[PDB]
Amino acid sequence: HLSDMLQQLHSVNASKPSERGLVRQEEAEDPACIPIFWVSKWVDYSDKYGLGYQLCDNSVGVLFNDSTRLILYNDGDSLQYIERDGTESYLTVSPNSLMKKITLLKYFRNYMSEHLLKAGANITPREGDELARLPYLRTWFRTRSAIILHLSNGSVQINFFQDHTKLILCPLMAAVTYIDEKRDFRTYRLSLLEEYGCCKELASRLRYARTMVDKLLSS
């Protein structure tokens, strides 16, 4: 979905949405496109093990340094293991081959609970299918300005370090959710931002997002 996201971002940015006589950003809001999933917490222990994270439904996962992923559902028992080549297996906490990674996941779990806030804690996620499988973390990287997190459902999340603003890009709905410095949040359809425009801050973050999606595609 990265190629689609790149096309959507190229389109919104070419419209120069902040270079307008009157920006009407509010008219581009569409609260129904709020995501089902985003990353609420993360821990970069890549010096040793990998990147642990929590999704907004309170499930957790780890992308290990060997590019494998282990996800624990919010039921506290169900696991999905994803190999480097993408092969998926469904297991429970209740194989010996995964004992070490399960232990690491629990420790990441505990650390996130002990030390970190839940991003978007005040946001009601969109309701989807209670029985659907969780997305997992495909890859991530850190720049001067942000951490970039790409989920297997196509979503790309960019969390900015300086002001704690966050972008969640959802290419299936061609939408973006923006969490601002005050933790207020809005969801926009990118096509409506073309129509109505947006402020320089959001325009800058959307240019930055396209740069990040290009980096993801280059990786």
Partner: peptide, 5 residues
């Protein structure tokens, strides 16, 4: 380790 807020 580095981490979120």
């Amino acid at each position: 380790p580095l981490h979120s807020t």
